Symmetry: D2
Subunit: 412 residues, 4 copies
């Protein structure tokens, strides 16, 4: 009752998972604190989130708290096969491998919304990006009354929730967990992706980072840390001013398309790098995306219009254009940190995932309350604000950070 | 109808103000856009904010939109005398000079609460730190019902608004301009902290160990500034979120006791009392530098220090050297008053343009909604943020200066971003 | 007449090499400029230097100029098997694979000092770290008078040359090529190696960087950029003062050994991380070396005293001590950038490799006029200072750097 | 026997000097170690070096070691009047004030070249820029045979010596102290560049575009300073090596004319003339700030700016605003003279301690070897560096102040580096 690339990678995955646990004290602490009470006993969680070593620790936290889970990846190139095998070996139903086709992707999510114990139906959703949420609401309406809550990981997913809400298409309440982890995360995993794919030198290069939210900020800091000159693009005046204040030129993509060695899309929006840009790119320009959906880059156009295509090695594709110059595309435009490397490290993921677990507890344990209503009163909510202090404190010992104590006088 | 140190500094103040104007396109654009409609005609603003070159651009912006003003500074050591004189010369009543006594300070704020046209009473408050807000509510109860609104500049001022509200002591509605700090507080301090320390002491930053107390936007800027020059910064915090942030930024997070013997420089940024104490001074290395950049000097136990030192020498104004029983020295900046304004010129005018543009839009907002119950007087009185569309407006006004070019969304892109 | 791991990796290695050529304008310009004149015709170069994609470009540059070459790697873990294969395929004798044993390592170097055309002997040495130099001098006395020069890449190798000279044991003249590129290289490749090995988060960590020469400076800057707190150790007061001026605490290994998450040795010296340190290290502390020799870390002691060992994957080993805690060792203490990632990237390797080619021309072409004496008068020399300018100039267009012209009046 | 602005600034001067002392352990330790033996007893030193608080500590170190000194500043706008006053009040002949005229500047130097005990003549030169060196050689040839050595502080002065030498015009031997430069220049400018700009103008660095011309140690420090505060720096260079370094550090390398219309701030650091010219001023954006941190003001064509501006306003001393014919303004700092010293206090004490400690060791070295020909007078004269091992000695003196703990090599480790228990 699983489908993965190679069950024999399980032993390697288990060792890697053991290393991540030691980097994920938030998750390990929730097991110690909540294990005895089993606050997720009864929960049947359909999960759609990149099947990584980090996610494996999230799954075993939810399981240790009593949940039953069925799992798939939310991207065709993000699964870490050793992690998926490590989880599959333990008997958790998981349907994930690195390098899925579109139809295999859709097949995998569908395996997670049936096959549980009892009537075989999920009662909880854990998503990021919003593919499992959209699949259930739009293609399993009979499931909709069965689901007590959604927890959502990422900006793109959160925007999908409000999109649905505004026009009466959200029948299940959600907890927004996405709302600087993604700044610090991309600060280390963007260049990891790029280097594993190309080994290219960052120092001395001109780079074009499109967008300057938390993800752009982190990407821009990462490249600049290594001696790249970063040019930023933005549609928002607030973020553009912040980029200038941080020492970056803010320009149009067209202003730099002929000089940039590297292009990185962070917008969460479509058609950022287009047919109007590719013909003008310098020889062997590197093109990649770190936004949730690959459509930030017109990959379709690029493949259809190149005179020649060579695969350097998986997720590194080199295209020869009519003009004779080359373009290097990473992970076919899919999120480059997970596509070409390992995504965000454990320590930062511990923050986000500790909230994921808390969001699942909060929705499950209030399923009959009208606190998170189903149907027409359904909304999008935040975790109670005291939990942000809870999560943060759980990570201080690991870094040796020692907190000062207010005196009675100071508190008041 | 004013009191400043020296009216002859007016011409120099005027030239500095003209340079500031060129660095404050937000304020200069408000004059262009709103001059015609005189939206503040009838407003009588009592202002209590550091009387600097930057504040003069603010005053003359409010004046150009039709307001009547009386002004004081919100700190005894923050006034720039040339800017105060330039304003006095124009006929705006201003009561401010660098180096006021506590009594002169209180006198100055009292001058802003009378002497207008008509009944002579203010109808609006623009405040920084809350001294004038407290003065009106606590000492002028007859005046309270004539004040249509407060705009507050700073974090501690905002903290004071909520504390008041929670005790049933806030009868006037306020707009929170500090949180409308992402900019003012971080970018501002990142440049003005070391400027203050340098003008005061000429000390090298590289090689030093610095203790930065607190890690909000103010502490983040300060720490970034000392770090950039090659200092090793140790951060202290009571809040786990902020402490994790500091550690993610490469800083050791520790107690003041952990570094008190090693730190060349101590900077308090908490907005709280008793950060650097009697428990700390006796253990500091020779010529350790102590300063504060939070709103009130009581972050440092200045009183205890002055009382317990064996000798005191004034190196130059706002730079004081204390010899302890140790035989060792401590250098104190601006008697613990905000060091950037006390020893240098505070935040540069570019970033002040952001906070002051907001300040003006807030006075406009509160003033024009006079008869609305949108900003209730009496029992329903609250703290409000500026309407959110204005944050984009303000940012946009500062982009041309920096040569920042915005991308235009296509119709399809615009549809699917809203 | 070669020995590599897998010849079928050649096609992949060739694509990698083609991408590197584009990032190495120095070497490609030498081919264009010196191709016609064949300045190395007759030279028979025994080469001992990390068999990487970058080195493959160097090998082909030397061959394009007329050299005959036989190659080995100067480290058991640094070879990139795709690069070794692509070179082997062309018919250049190379004896290198990732994961050599010591006997295999020695055998590989033996293969490069015999088997050329004519009498089968080399007449030129290209070295990285001194091993090939030491082999010829100490174990091949008959060969010594046949070698017309040595060029040496690295600090450790340069110190070995001056040591030999001072004892009268240098019978062959050398060009010191080592003498910032190591700073820029390590700043990008130290973290690349740590991350490919462990996927650990850098932000929030305490790191102990031993040594503050160009390598240490780059390592510290890398770790600091990702938000680590770096403590530096030094024996030289000049380097120690620089580290303080750059914002780093300078302390002893024993001052931080209990708290450091990562240890990085950069000294070029032995016994930096010892039996006096391992037992006090926190759980899952990461220990790695980026200096030329592994003996900076007491790996033999660690392995002999660990109560448990687990290979997480090749070149990542976790040791359980008697105290119950774990130590993570990267590449068995061998240079971590090369052993766990790909080493310095192409662009920066182009600087020193352009100089290697030039040193080799210089030595070879002046082999008879006594400019570089053999025997008693042998010395260590530098390239003429005007070549430093020429090499740098070849790399400016790639980064879009526009040089200002002095006016005639400014020149004087 | 002195000429300063205002002897009543002596009290302030002295307090500041005492604080500087605490920041200058190199000089303070040399006082302690060489005091008893009086190595400079007999030395008569003509000094020409910015008359700052830092220099005062240097002066008093030299006197504490037995020297007679006569001092002038090496720049018109760099004297700190409180420091000069404190020095004069001790009875050391000093001729220096902030804001000297050219004529007064030369007069000041002339006063240092006579008036000692005995025949009233100097036998040593401590220089910064080469002005005093050039006066003695070109204008006092009867004095050349009397001078036992020159110690030179700065890059420009060192260029001046090599230039002289190559034309047979160096008859006194010099110690190159500048090559110090790894420290003084980079770390010093990194803090003092922006200090000068801000004291002058209070301008925000964040968000600005800056043109930094040259990328030697000074340009590197100036670029790092501006970038730290969030400015975007464009670097200009004539040397491919430096240009590649700037590029590997994340800076665009371009021509002045590529960024002259966009730049808010211009900083010249080349040590060369005619960097910012009549070709640039007319295209500058409104209130562009132009300054120089290189030794001579002629990097910027100030003569031209002043003669061609339609309006001039002195904002305050050393801050001058010019209205061009196009109606736009240009803000010039310290009339193009070194901005860190001209508009602020120069490099801070701690870093000057390294440079000045070398200065003292250079004077001891030249003086104590005067009758043995190690440093030849006459046609055999040349430029030398300090003994190699003094570098480590100087650096080690400054480690305690910053709390840096040195690792001690074991005997086995010293064998391997092949060094004593000098290192590099
Ligand atoms: N790969 C990862 O590990 C990772 C991590 C977090 C988030 N994400 C995804 O990355 C994306 C960005 O996340 P975020 O939190 O920064 O979102 P964000 O919305 O805060 O940032 C996007 C920014 O892009 C700007 N933008 C939109 N269209 C643009 C265009 N036409 N040109 C230039 N700028 C444009 C917007 O103004 C906005 O400031 C989202 O899709 C999110 O789901 C990925
Ligand atoms: N000088 C200026 O130009 C300037 C500019 C902006 C704000 N301010 C003032 O600076 C102060 C701080 O502003 P902010 O926006 O950063 O406020 P903030 O509330 O966001 O930051 C203060 C931080 O200090 C911490 N803290 C509180 N007590 C502490 C203690 N005893 N020890 C260690 N940490 C402690 C809190 O956790 C908090 O993170 C306020 O007084 C504000 O008005 C001054
Ligand atoms: N892995 C790579 O890609 C790479 C690149 C260049 C150089 N290297 C090698 O790295 C090593 C360092 O190179 P470098 O150029 O920085 O040389 P370096 O000699 O300039 O730096 C070594 C530093 O370590 C210090 N040191 C020596 N022993 C010490 C000890 N016991 N404790 C603390 N500090 C000590 C020295 O004082 C010196 O400052 C050499 O072995 C060199 O060949 C490796
Ligand atoms: N103000 C101070 O405290 C201070 C401190 C140290 C040195 N200095 C002075 O600063 C100047 C520079 O010192 P440095 O040590 O950096 O010298 P340097 O010679 O090492 O650097 C100057 C750089 O400028 C470049 N350059 C020359 N002409 C150029 C031009 N036309 N356009 C662009 N680049 C050009 C050169 O290639 C060189 O790299 C000297 O005059 C020195 O004496 C001042
Ligand atoms: N290593 C990882 N494992 C699982 N999810 C990750 C990892 N790195 C990033 N992500 C998540 O992917 C989401 C975008 O799809 C981001 O919000 C981010 O949290
Ligand atoms: N130059 C300045 N002029 C006026 N107000 C300033 C200046 N610099 C800082 N401030 C304000 O002082 C407040 C703290 O009292 C901060 O909110 C900050 O905005
Ligand atoms: N990718 C690489 N290919 C070949 N040599 C490298 C590479 N990266 C680093 N090196 C060299 O290894 C030497 C240390 O033995 C360093 O001086 C460095 O130049
Ligand atoms: N505070 C200072 N006192 C004296 N000289 C200084 C000071 N700051 C910089 N300088 C020197 O000015 C010389 C250039 O004229 C530089 O070599 C620099 O060392």
């Amino acid at each position: 009752d699983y489908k993965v690339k190679d069950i024999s990678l399980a032993e390697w995955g288990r060792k890697a998972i053991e290393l991540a646990e030691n980097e994920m004290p938030g998750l390990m602490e929730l097991r110690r604190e909540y294990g005895p009470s089993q606050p997720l006993k009864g929960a049947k969680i359909a999960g759609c989130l990149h099947m990584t070593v980090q996610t494996a620790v999230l799954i075993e936290t939810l399981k240790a708290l009593g949940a039953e889970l069925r799992w798939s990846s939310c991207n065709i190139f993000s699964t870490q096969d050793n992690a998926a095998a490590a989880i599959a070996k333990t008997g958790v139903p998981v349907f994930a491998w690195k390098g899925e086709t579109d139809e295999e992707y859709e097949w995998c999510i569908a395996q997670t919304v049936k096959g549980f114990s009892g009537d075989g139906l999920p009662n909880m959703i854990l998503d990021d990006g919003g593919d499992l949420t959209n699949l259930v609401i739009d293609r399993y309406p009979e499931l909709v009354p069965k689901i007590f809550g959604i927890s959502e990981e990422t900006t793109t997913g959160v925007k999908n929730l409000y999109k649905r809400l505004s026009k009466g298409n959200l029948p299940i309440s959600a907890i927004n967990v996405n709302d600087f982890d993604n700044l610090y995360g991309c600060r280390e995993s963007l260049v990891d992706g790029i280097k594993r794919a190309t080994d290219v030198m960052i120092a001395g290069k001109t780079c074009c980072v499109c967008g300057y939210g938390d993800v752009g900020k982190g990407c821009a800091a990462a490249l600049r840390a290594f001696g790249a000159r970063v040019v930023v693009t933005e549609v928002d005046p607030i973020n553009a001013l912040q980029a200038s204040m941080e020492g970056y030129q803010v320009a149009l993509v067209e202003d730099v398309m002929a000089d940039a060695h590297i292009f990185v899309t962070t917008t969460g929006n479509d058609d950022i790098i287009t047919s109007d840009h590719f013909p003008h790119m310098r020889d062997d320009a590197i093109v990649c995306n770190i936004g949730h959906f690959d459509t930030e880059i017109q990959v379709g156009w690029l493949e259809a219009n190149a005179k020649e295509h060579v695969e350097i090695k998986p997720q590194v594709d080199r295209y020869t254009m009519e003009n004779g110059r080359h373009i290097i595309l990473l992970a076919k435009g899919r999120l480059v940190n997970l596509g070409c490397a390992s995504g965000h490290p454990s320590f930062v993921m511990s923050n986000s995932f500790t909230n994921q677990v808390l969001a699942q507890i909060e929705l499950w344990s209030n399923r009959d309350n009208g606190k998170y209503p189903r149907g027409d009163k359904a909304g999008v909510f935040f975790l109670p604000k005291a939990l942000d202090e809870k999560v943060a404190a759980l990570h201080l010992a690991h870094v040796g950070a020692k907190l000062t104590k207010l005196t009675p006088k100071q508190a008041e």
